Design a protein around this ligand. Structure first.
Ligand SMILES: [Ca+2]
Ligand SMILES: [Zn+2]
Length: 182
């Protein structure tokens, strides 16, 4: 099998401005591209797992999300960071867009995306890490049996509940490689 770093996006990889769907509003957090490179060098698979309820809300389309994700995927690959999987949940139970309106198994804190990635890539879960800025990230990880749950300070002023559920709290994903090496 392979160990993985599971990655939230908004608040973790990019600055969370709310329903980010435009290239011109996608801002990589300082140091995270370099950190992801290092994580790849240290033998981790990298898997994005992102809730994208803006699709169900009609803030933007799945077409627009794919355009952005393609761009993000190239941008990283061009910086020697080759993502192993990108999983997203377009769903919301109250979605205005019928196609995406539903309770689902993939919306964090449900561990669905992490389980799919596990089965696809043959991921060693106990040897893996989840990194996110929200409670829902930590809860998805515990459910999927992710060995280490890492909260970051780059998004939402963290809640006590999110901090409670996390194993580690780091300022940024940029700090992860050094934390793992230590
Ligand atoms: Ca987030
Ligand atoms: Zn879903």
């Amino acid at each position: 099998s392979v160990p993985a770093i599971f990655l939230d996006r908004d608040g973790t990889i990019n600055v969370d401005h709310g329903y980010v769907h435009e290239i011109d509003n996608f801002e990589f957090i300082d140091g995270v591209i370099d950190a992801m490179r290092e994580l790849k060098k240290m033998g981790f698979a990298l898997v994005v797992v992102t809730n994208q309820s803006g699709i169900a809300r009609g803030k933007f389309t799945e077409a627009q999300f794919e355009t952005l994700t393609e761009w993000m995927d190239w941008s990283l690959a061009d910086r020697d960071v080759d993502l192993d999987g990108i999983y997203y949940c377009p769903h919301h139970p109250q979605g205005s867009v019928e196609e995406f309106r539903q309770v689902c198994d993939c919306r964090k804190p449900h561990p669905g995306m992490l389980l799919s990635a596990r089965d696809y890539l043959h991921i060693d879960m106990a040897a893996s890490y989840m990194v996110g800025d929200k409670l829902e990230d930590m809860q998805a990880a515990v459910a999927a049996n992710v060995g280490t749950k890492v909260l970051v300070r780059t998004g939402k002023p963290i809640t006590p509940e999110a901090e409670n559920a996390a194993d580690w709290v780091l300022n940024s994903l940029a700090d992860l490689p050094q934390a793992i090496k230590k």
